[model samples]
Target chain A: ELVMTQSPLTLSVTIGQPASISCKSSQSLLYSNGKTYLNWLLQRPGQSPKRLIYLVSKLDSGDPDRFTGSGSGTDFTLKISRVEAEDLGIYYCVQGSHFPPTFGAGTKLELKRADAAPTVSIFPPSSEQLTSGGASVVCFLNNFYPKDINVKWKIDGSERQNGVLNSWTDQDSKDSTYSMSSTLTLTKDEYERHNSYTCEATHKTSTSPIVKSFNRN
Target chain B: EVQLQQSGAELVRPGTSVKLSCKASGYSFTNYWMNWLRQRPGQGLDWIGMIHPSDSETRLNQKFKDKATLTVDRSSSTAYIQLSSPTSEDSAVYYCARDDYDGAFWGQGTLVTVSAAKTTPPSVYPLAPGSAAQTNSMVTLGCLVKGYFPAPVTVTWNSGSLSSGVHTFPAVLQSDLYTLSSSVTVPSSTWPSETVTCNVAHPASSTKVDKKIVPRD
Candidate 1:
């Protein structure tokens, strides 16, 4: 019988703060030749998992220097110094002492999102559907921080105040990060007549407004 | 920058087959290995297998050997996984990741639902270190058994008529399986007995596994 368990389950830390996770094995991981086969792995948001350390304390080939592994026998620990934005996700401990390797139940790491810009994308009307002989141009702004945001649209350099706007805060995200979308419906003639349309987003944390443009062909 | 674009969800009849795809961009696709991971509803993650795009070298988890086939197209920089004989157990989310050990980059997951029946066992063995150096005329004997799945196991020491100190830790889930271990300590003189044994029991099998350890003189 062989087993490994990780503690705390979850970790919440701000940027530049230190954090640590614990792993305990039921038996002494040390082999007869005096080597322990324990490893640490981390999976970041929207990314694949990565091994941070191997053989109990040795860092993986290209892992960051901020992560460190230490301990022997039954007790082990993984420490992160000065957490970074990229460190948000789950961490797992793996044991290779036995025939079939094993991993610890993952521990999650949550990081508060700092001020960030939203990614903007534009979807133009196509053959899918039509709205009263008018074309709908939708602009999506996602992954921004601070729920309070202002999105505006302009046609031919003039403010278009009649567009529809919708925004929502992410349910699972910390710091009230939000996503917003704006749709501008214009007559077929008006859409074809105008040479350009622009979408702009304003947030308190931004020094300048974020802008995206769509050019009519 | 490495980008992985995955296919959409699929719903197929039982006993049928489906193929999923992941398109990579912005990086040399052949330079890194492509891997797959699975996650069932309300369950954790499992590693499926990986393929080296350069040479098309493939390897799969023994459990999935007969169920999955890994392939790739170097011209399109796309990786594909074909799952055969779909069952309800295959109704889970699958993700394409980069690399063999840790997935540093990943594609969005694709959901595959198999509208059919699903079915799935355990094995255990004990191990003792080759040699244990005496410290102050005392030595600790560790009993480790692994490679059991779905079934929780119990481990015990049979130390006939001799006073023994035992420490046991709860089993841990590993790679969708479980492992556990226990340890006992006694004076170096008493540790020399050839009758010391480790017994492992589980509900999946009626026959218990016992392995005796003969302490070295």
Candidate 2:
């Protein structure tokens, strides 16, 4: 069997904190078929590593449309929407395309609870995709400095409503990383005329103030 | 816990072929794909490919496409691999692996030696602290067996004292088509230099036979 081991069983980080994890293989997972058989999975505390991405970086069918996977060959990444309580636990990278298929040790996603971090970044920035005479808003905060951010469509910029957000993150460094996205359904006029759509990034660190704001689209 | 144990050492002349088998233990053998792998000491692992026992579907590594063939016997849950055109290069250790995405479980390796090149005599080395002085003493050993590989081989030591080290070495056919020879050093410290040994072990067994004279300072 191929050797697989992991370090730092537990990690402690603040809310709205940026973090990174790496997966490595004993041998090159590259196959002659051009695509390596490596895949990334997330297995929170008591769960098994669920298929986060297959065939390396290709997202699985209907993967929330928010979770993104980037990287190739033996190196890979799996990000998640704002590090919520559910995000805590291990992540694993596996290779199935070659002999003695093996996996990289898993990485645990720690919790960092913060009041105000990066607000979410929803899609349809201009609110054009809503219904005709309807508005569609696509908000993608490509680089959320402190990955702890989420995007929301607030009618009148207040009054909490129901929305679904699917996000992922690839913590590139020790002190920074960002991710969080949510989607909501709205009526034609209500979505178009609503001047209260906002993407906010919350940070627990007192040095950085709360990042939240509204937009017209 | 399924265990795959292999046979033992095989001696074949060049231009010949050798087939090895792996016996599987535990678990429903039909539930998984059994694969074969090859490795020369200190080298990286090579996926020789896999075979589905029930359907006998086989996929091989392009590099070994013509070198090895994988077949399985569902009734026995045993996997067999054939190596053709036995060249000196094919004289390494071969292993059978169980297909598990997390990592394959493996059997002990089999060693096949091509005995044609130069027909070099199997060199004998001593490994005991005092066997050094006993080197070249010309000893003979005997084993009551049906038949042996190297044919027409009978020798006696000066002692005629049933010095079991000397024996009728089996007569191994040296096909003029092509042939190669190899020598294995047996550590005498474990054996009292009096056991009757034979080269009948299958190529897949993990145990190695190294008969050598002890080096004394």
What would the per-residue lDDT of candidate 2 be over residues B79-100, giving only the tens digit for each residue?
8999877676676678786645
DockQ scores of the candidates: 0.02, 0.01
Look at candidate 1 and tell me the lDDT of residue A92. 81
Which regions in candidate 2 have their CA more than 4 angstroms from the true location?
A1-73, A76-217, B101-103, B117-217
Q: Across residues A168-215, which tens digit of lDDT does each residue of candidate 1 receive?
A: 423234433455546565667767778777778888777798776666
Superpose all Cα atoms of candidate 1 onto the true structure and report the RMSD in Å to 1 decimal.
Answer: 32.0
- Please give the clash total of every predicted structure, in order: 4, 80
Standalone chain B TM-score for every prediction: 0.52, 0.54
lDDT of 1 by residue, B168-209 (tens): 444543334444445555667766654667676776555467
How is the predicted docking of candidate 1 categorized under the CAPRI scheme?
incorrect
Most accurate candidate by lDDT = 1
Interface RMSD of 2: 32.6
TM-score of each: 0.43, 0.35
CAPRI docking class of candidate 2: incorrect
